[PDB]
Amino acid sequence: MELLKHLSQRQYIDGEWVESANKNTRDIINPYNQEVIFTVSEGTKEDAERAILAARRAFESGEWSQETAETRGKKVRAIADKIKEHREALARLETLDTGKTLEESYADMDDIHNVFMYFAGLADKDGGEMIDSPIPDTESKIVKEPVGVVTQITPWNYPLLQASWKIAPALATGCSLVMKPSEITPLTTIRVFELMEEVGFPKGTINLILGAGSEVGDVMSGHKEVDLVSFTGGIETGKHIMKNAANNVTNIALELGGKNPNIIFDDADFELAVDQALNGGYFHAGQVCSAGSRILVQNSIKDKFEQALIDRVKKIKLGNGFDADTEMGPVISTEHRNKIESYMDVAKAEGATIAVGGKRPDRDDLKDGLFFEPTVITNCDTSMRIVQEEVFGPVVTVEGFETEQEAIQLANDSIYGLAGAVFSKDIGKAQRVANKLKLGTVWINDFHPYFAQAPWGGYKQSGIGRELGKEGLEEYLVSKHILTNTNPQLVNWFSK
Amino acid sequence: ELLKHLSQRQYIDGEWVESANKNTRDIINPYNQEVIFTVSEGTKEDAERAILAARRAFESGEWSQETAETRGKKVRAIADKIKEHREALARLETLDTGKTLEESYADMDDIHNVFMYFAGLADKDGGEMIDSPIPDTESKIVKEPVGVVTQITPWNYPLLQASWKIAPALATGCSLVMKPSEITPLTTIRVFELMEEVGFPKGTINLILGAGSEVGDVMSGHKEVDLVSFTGGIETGKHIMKNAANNVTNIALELGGKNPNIIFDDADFELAVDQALNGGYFHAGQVCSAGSRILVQNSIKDKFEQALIDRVKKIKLGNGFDADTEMGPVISTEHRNKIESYMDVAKAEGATIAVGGKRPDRDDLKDGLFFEPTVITNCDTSMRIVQEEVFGPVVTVEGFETEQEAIQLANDSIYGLAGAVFSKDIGKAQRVANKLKLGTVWINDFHPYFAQAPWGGYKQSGIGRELGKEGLEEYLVSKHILTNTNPQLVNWFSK
Amino acid sequence: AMELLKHLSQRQYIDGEWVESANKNTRDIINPYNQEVIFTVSEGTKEDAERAILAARRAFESGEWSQETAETRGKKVRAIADKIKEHREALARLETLDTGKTLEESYADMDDIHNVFMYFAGLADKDGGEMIDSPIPDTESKIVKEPVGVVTQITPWNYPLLQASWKIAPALATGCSLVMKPSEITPLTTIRVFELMEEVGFPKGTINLILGAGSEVGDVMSGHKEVDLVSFTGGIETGKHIMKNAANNVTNIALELGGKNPNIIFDDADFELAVDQALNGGYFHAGQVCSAGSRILVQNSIKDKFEQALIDRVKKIKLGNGFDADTEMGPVISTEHRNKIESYMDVAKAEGATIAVGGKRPDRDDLKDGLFFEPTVITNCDTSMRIVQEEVFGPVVTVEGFETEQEAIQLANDSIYGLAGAVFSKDIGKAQRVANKLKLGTVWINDFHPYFAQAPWGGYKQSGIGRELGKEGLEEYLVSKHILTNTNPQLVNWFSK
Amino acid sequence: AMELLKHLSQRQYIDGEWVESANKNTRDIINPYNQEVIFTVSEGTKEDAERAILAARRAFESGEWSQETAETRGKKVRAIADKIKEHREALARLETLDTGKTLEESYADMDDIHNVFMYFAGLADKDGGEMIDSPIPDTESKIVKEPVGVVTQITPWNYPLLQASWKIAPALATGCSLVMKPSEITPLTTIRVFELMEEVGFPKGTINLILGAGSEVGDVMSGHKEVDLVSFTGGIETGKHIMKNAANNVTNIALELGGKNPNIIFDDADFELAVDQALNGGYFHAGQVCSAGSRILVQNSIKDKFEQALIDRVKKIKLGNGFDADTEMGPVISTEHRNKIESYMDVAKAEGATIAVGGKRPDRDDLKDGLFFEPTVITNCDTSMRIVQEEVFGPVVTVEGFETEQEAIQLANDSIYGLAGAVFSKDIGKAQRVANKLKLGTVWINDFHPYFAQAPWGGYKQSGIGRELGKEGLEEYLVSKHILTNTNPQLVNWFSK
Ligand code: NA
Ligand code: NA
Ligand code: NA
Ligand code: NA
């Protein structure tokens, strides 16, 4: 690729592109063919610490934290414009690094532009409140300040998208940040740091660490100079991060995936429900925190639905994300493919049926890549691990339900709470169901939509906090009550 | 006499019940160390049963789907019962905690106002309509009760801290399980009796009594809890947060502070002396926001120290029920011993105990848990006595030269709860206030808090806020409902 | 209620004192059920109104209420709420005696009035303004919300105390001083609420009650230089006059002027529900409701079925005394109003519309002395007609057909009004599409009539200006002030030295 | 700027087309520096204004802009902002040519205008309404915020493009259709911004520009039945007339009418700062500012010192061409306006005040052909005088003394106006006390003149109705609709079956 020839291979710490302190590197792979496409620095825990201290120094200097909100918004808008300027190259880089189709990558770049633009526009819209004090002769106000130094850890599935959800509000509010992308997908994050450097930020305001979570993650979540740890990734890693953050009573924001229900009533638009069940299950080979992996279909149409879904799954076009005909790319890594494979064994052992798929494809052009066939698992129930646990692959389970009440009970019967859908032409019924689902986002007759204007996050074990919207911006602010006594008098409680 | 009718049991799923193992605990009055009452000492199985009842009640919808307006009326009824029983409640609080009766009356007036504020807020939101960027879609954000909440309160202001938690939980439609400090359960039992009189669906409210070491882990680590709200010591709070991580549970923590009281040379001097005493010694300094760290400008430091010391010598110690008392005892033998151990630390580090620093030897104080009001001088920021929260009737005094030095010293702690700036130059006070990393800053005052404004800490003083609209938000969760009003097939996957 | 009258004040309330009219003029108040004089009250002069406004101003400038804490103001408003509930029975009876509506309707009003006061009591201390992130370095920018000032409040005869509560509650919660004048023909419950407010206690001049003819004191109330907001609920022609008067001092105006409210019924509506709600929309309080569903728009496919069902039910509506439990519809308010409704029947027929049922005064012996008018359905009409375009404010509905969803919307929006309306359909998606396109302040989906303190109420187009109820209602009683402090002021040195 | 004119449109913009007046009439535009005709534009008719309003209505109902996503509407408003910055130099020159103010003042306006459009671009998609916790079981209650509808916008001659931006930005951000008419004497930058908006692209009829006499088209713009909001910035007498016309259709009005703005200087103010800011308050744009500090209130203890210092500086103010870098104050806007200012000097003297300096046209050769009026200080005056009570809107200040903080507040509030004012004192607590008591929409503490898009601007009392700028400014362009859905509808069964 033309693009890689000019892309930085280094970390960005305190205004400089720097190698790892130990000079180590890591080879980055294209999951389509398992070929090494780039080599980047693999940073140390001391590099992460230096970045955090630089972020703290920059925060205390006030160069960004005391800049006007209006000016901060103009700089965030400049980032947005660079994303659009470089839309094609960024999308290509994301497809090369993550394997998803170019069309999916273009959608991400449009969303990223809009995320930065939304937060640019929100930057100067709310500085706090005046309170009508209950104490005569006092003035009470609540001022909103940037939370401080923030550490930000992003996942491999949508690297630049998830990075934008964190960077945009942090910069808009005046925070300093240290970001570490997934060790296996750093390309677009490196590129966005180049673009941010072009816009221009005070030294130490933005920092990029590259490397293994196992090497630098503990410093990023446990350092005393951090005010907020924002992590998007796996549940076990998230819980560890939160336990680390507790050592300094540090604010945490977590987005950890889900077991997202796709509820299809017998009065759904049937062909729409089939289309959206495929979309829910198989976009990005199901490697989506909000993938519709748990299909709940009304008993009366269950057989019809399974036959239609299976017939379509057999036609899904696997291939290179750069090829126009491809509908589904490979999964991200050998380890991840192996995990998906292990879940097939679990499903069968529990008594479920692998109705279609469940193996690596044999076709010659797919043999060198990390492909896994789109899969439908039938004859399963809520007690099963395959239904309860997040596989994060191109796999859906299908369960039947008899009544609206049973659909709700089954949908809520998981440890998760991120997103889900209800399909029915009876909008009143869909609305009743939506109000009873313990999910951060519920779609009525759709699957997948998210946008900067609305908060995204989970109930239960799917996370803590929200990203996007006004609530997303609030994670990056802290409230201070300043109370002035305008006619102070001695209390005279203690003897004189 | 009040005690003769007070319940001795836990309240679980609409019934007053003993501990599952029939264990009990004797409650002590710190003024004389006498046993005043005996209550059930619950088990982790009792706490679990309460959590499961709260969950069942939440899912039934009897409270969670009640109208917000009606929920507000019930919260207002609790407020009115607090006022109705103000006398008895104040007396119980002084008996249990040792603070003066006048301090307890002030608490009861505040508690009435906390409930009343949240009663009035209950029906004032609901969420937002969003202008969706996707044509032919409707986007709304609904605010729902967070769910089942566990609430753990401290021994210093038991009913006040209980009200900060109960009021928004009930206003929003949550179910709750509360556990007061094992050593100070009396007013919390009484408020449960009063809430039962108001009337709530079975399982909506539950009271567990017992050791944090026995039931705290289940209250913070149970899968059916959606929010853990804890007010207490830093080490316990960290543990609670680690437990809450097991189920990715929301946490709200209020953990105390090392709160600065910054006195400039242009402060109203007698006001600053009065407020330094108030900051340091109300409730024998057992206040999350006590002004234990006095920072005074160098040019008036000597004058200030002499004035403060002279006043400290006159502070009247005694029974909280006696009107002349200005400062009562500290809470327990263990707590007094901890304060005593800090005096040893201070001297070993090279600081000066300028006045106090020991138990008083006056006949009427000998049987109680008294500790003299104390001033520590000749200390600096590197010392443990300056950095660590003693939570007793002790203040340190450090000098500073410039406004910049005052800010640097004030911010040089792991904490961030509250603090004050005293200066007749309001512009200067405002500049300092904007630079202090504290949840509340008072200009020419010390101690004020109220339901209308959020309270909480930066840094290691906590996570989240109590009081105000932000306090209510801890008890809500957002749901984005997106309806596609003209759905079309995407036709991405081949047919 | 006649026993309640033995203790009710007959006077105005000005600057903390119950006072008669300056010229000792009075007015006899009538019960519309039997046209009997039930009470006599003071009929104030324009000088009395001026004295009340000046007292309100003096009180406002003293700060005793305007600078009271918001939390305390809220407690006082809550005290009023509690008095409404305490006196629910007597107030409901007084309202039925004065206005003629059923006692059950009056009880519902009193429950609502309690909730209005309680809502605003709870809202009183929940704002104060905002801190702005200033774009100018070394400045502090804040927006403080203050009471608007002195407010004049003019209420209608249909729901006197309810409409009074909508104005009084936010005015007191925010710290304004007010001067209220109820409809000259229905002052009873307003006098009573002033007695109750006095019991709670407010600073002298904070609340004032003028009694009398809009033709005598209305110009002073809308045109005085010391007034900051004129809030009027009533007829369109009077409202326009009030607004023109208010312009003389560039005074804020809040107006609620009624409507021609559509009740849109699709062929997939729950049919019996739609018939029930069309009756409710048309005939509660004899149709004397700002939001009455006087304009029924029914899908052509079910128009004949609907008209027959509605007409059959209208024939069964029970007319009588509002105090009698069997009564479903009381009389209209006055001779003048009944005559106006009657004149509309002539207009309808001359335009070619059909009076399908009703359209006259009833003859029954027990109804002959009262101001009764039969519930009426007008059919075979179209949007070009005066009977369809103009607000009759009586127990009368028109019925028009529509073919499509698009035509329903076009017809519903083809009026000068914009207050409220409904859409009936089991297809909630369709109902939502229609609701988004109706130019109305409130749209009900599968309901008719609901309003409550938590949500703003008011009209698009000629139905009004501004909103009452909700947070927006409170905002009518506030004014914003931007205070900008330069914390490091420097000379500009633009002009030569 | 004369080269810029060679490419500038001379026509109105109606329903997507640049068009002449229906009667082919034109108007010559003058440069106040030399009274030379610099451009000739169409002078539209009342039928042109009506056609624009009908086009705006048609466009609104088509939904092309009103139903466009808020995010996309914001992007288009941002595009306007970027064009203002792109064309900053030419626009600033055009504004100085048309209005006479200094080029440096015009550059500052263009920077502000960019920021106004950018603020509203960023606000466009940040609301939408509220979800309400309904008090009725089994109902859903929401408040949707919609564009108000069709808006007419009338701007003043002092800051034409700035005032235009305050109106255009929120109207387009919210999805309204608009019809704008700039001051007949200063249309240049408004024509230019319409060219720039056309480049960005809006649906046909969404934006319209009428050019002409308020006396010819103002009545249609304020009195047409298809208008939902009339937004006017200008003189008090015209504003009152506009409000009275708007009343004919119960149309929302937003007015900004100027003020008698106090500049309060305590004896503990930074003295040289107060002198600098008194000059700035009085004489920027030759005092032709809605918020000019024309009414100086100075503590008696320093009044003599202050008057002498102010007068000595006023004598040094440099008058000249706004294009010349040394000029500090340009000419006034027109012959009629200069004559009005002159007539006030006669009034002042007849009332017993002293013209301490200025009060006449300057004689210098390079100023003789222009509409210059000397910077003037009037002393020995009091609150009872017309010169103190009435807005001159020229390069003139009055000076009155006060003894105490209480007297400063009483005098400052003793006018019919309520737009802006300042308090100068190093005692910030005192300045805050005074600021809280001044009945003014904006109060500056130790500053004079600041305004910005982030904070609302507008007047108490006769200075206006409503606010421009900030979130409140956006709200003038929105309307609330309460949609209440009954999710389990049941028959009421009130009326007999
Ligand atoms: Na969670
Ligand atoms: Na913290
Ligand atoms: Na209107
Ligand atoms: Na006004």
Author numbering:
A (entry chain C): 1 to 496
B (entry chain D): 2 to 496
C (entry chain A), D (entry chain B): 0 to 496
Published text:
We studied a putative BADH from an early MRSA COL isolate, denoted SaBADH, and showed that it is a functional NAD+-dependent BADH that utilizes BA as the primary substrate. BADHs are a group of enzymes from the aldehyde dehydrogenase (ALDH) superfamily that primarily catalyze the oxidation of betaine aldehyde (BA) to betaine; some BADHs also utilize other substrates. BADHs resemble ALDH in structure and are composed of a Rossmann-fold NAD(P)-binding domain, a catalytic (substrate-binding) domain and an oligomerization (bridging) domain. The solution data are supported by the structural analysis and emphasize the importance of the NAD+-driven structural rearrangements at the cofactor-binding and substrate-binding sites for enzymatic activity.
